[PDB]
């Protein structure tokens, strides 16, 4: 198979406006949402039916209690970070944690935090250390680096638990996560511009270029979600004889004009 990833994101907001959650947590396998928790629902709920079908009520009951704990911790971390900075008003704290299983069998793992949307702390699980953008971060990193038991816990969690969870979720969601939906590709003329457009494709990684006479200044439309689990994208130009080239999950395609 191809590379896969489990990531969990956390977002907290101090004195958030009405309706807006103080705290959100969402999990992803690759691009697919699997789980959600927030401060308004106070419940860990599946975000994919192959999660809801393969995990009993006690899984959700237990992670509900865990995500209540984490919500409280995040609120406290964020008030501490704000006083260290002498920041008043609404401010942001974000965390991303997860692991990758590559084609080779090899793994990666990562854990970072952002404050008001900027790099703040990045963990190195191999040197069992924390990189800090500034000195307020350094202070927090030092306290965390003083607790060897916790650093070792995280390393173990990234390298062993996270991967174990990734393998279990891939099995549950294999029909979705390991399928291939080749692109439908077509050419439209305009303004005198040619448009190579691709849609109905999964996974989202695709390469698209243009070539005169098989020899290689191009506008790229970003890879956008189509809303049904597939994705779409285009590439455009303004010699004589041109051709659009598309590569996706190890298949090359060519449209001549």
């Amino acid at each position: 198979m191809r590379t896969h990833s489990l990531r969990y994101f956390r977002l907290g907001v101090s004195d958030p406006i009405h309706g807006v959650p103080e705290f959100i947590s969402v999990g992803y396998v690759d691009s697919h949402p699997i789980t959600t928790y927030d401060s308004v629902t106070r419940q860990k709920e599946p975000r994919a039916p192959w999660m809801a079908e393969n995990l009993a009520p006690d899984h959700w009951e237990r992670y509900t209690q865990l995500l209540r704990g984490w919500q409280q911790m995040f609120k406290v971390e964020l008030k501490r970070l704000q006083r260290h900075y002498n920041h008043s008003g609404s401010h942001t704290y974000q965390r991303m944690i997860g692991c990758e299983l590559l084609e080779d069998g090899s793994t990666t793992g990562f854990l970072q935090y952002a404050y008001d949307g900027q790099d703040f702390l990045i963990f190195n699980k191999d040197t069992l250390s924390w990189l800090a953008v500034d000195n307020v971060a350094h202070t927090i990193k030092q306290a965390w680096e003083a607790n060897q038991h916790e650093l070792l816990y995280q390393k173990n969690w990234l390298e062993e638990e996270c991967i174990a969870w990734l393998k279990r979720f891939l099995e549950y969601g294999k029909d979705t996560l390991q399928r291939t939906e080749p692109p439908l590709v077509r050419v439209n003329r305009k303004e005198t511009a040619l448009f190579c457009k691709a849609h109905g494709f999964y996974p989202p990684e695709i390469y698209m270029t243009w070539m005169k006479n098989g020899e290689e200044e191009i506008d790229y439309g970003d890879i956008l979600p189509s809303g049904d689990g597939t994705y779409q994208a285009w590439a455009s130009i303004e010699s004589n004889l041109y051709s659009c080239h598309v590569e996706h999950s190890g298949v090359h395609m060519v449209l001549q004009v």
Partner: antibody
Amino acid sequence: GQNIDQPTEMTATEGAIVQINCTYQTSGFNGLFWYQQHAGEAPTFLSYNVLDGLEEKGRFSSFLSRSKGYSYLLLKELQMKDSASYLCAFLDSNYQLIWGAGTKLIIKP
Amino acid sequence: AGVTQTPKFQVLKTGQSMTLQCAQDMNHNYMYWYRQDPGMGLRLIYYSASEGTTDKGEVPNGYNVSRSTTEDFPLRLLSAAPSQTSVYFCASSNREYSPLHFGNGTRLTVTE
């Protein structure tokens, strides 16, 4: 995380060495703890091991083998005050704390 | 500092009501109630991941808890039964994976 074994009772001599073993079986692990509980007293934390290896702190040492599902607590130069129950516990993938029944250590004067 | 559990000893008539106190000044998010019975070891009654929530352990039946504050986690016996004769340990931990700090226990006997 399901099972955990440690012996009911051990007896060693003042001045000598004692090794309290703990075997565990589980699919999912966030570390193994040893606690000390004196008669009529509260347990207190001794050790946390999560990777393969050995940790020491004064006369006490804690070892973990991940592949064998195996820890020991090693007590050196036994004093009479080391007479206590020793509780081995482990966290599963959901952070459930699984407690062994405890090992009562008797120090022979 | 530490965990303060009260009372240390308690006798009850069958059907009487009882609340055990437990306080910690260490800003710990997690608090726990265990009973300890010969041979079994430590049996979780209830735990609380933070103020505002609580959840059952393995033996919640006959017991109730509140987590109104970070500091306090009372354990309630609604209707004392002989089978609740035990030693109760309250505990706190900073995180779900961090070490437990125990209160000094409650020796509780329920008699007819």
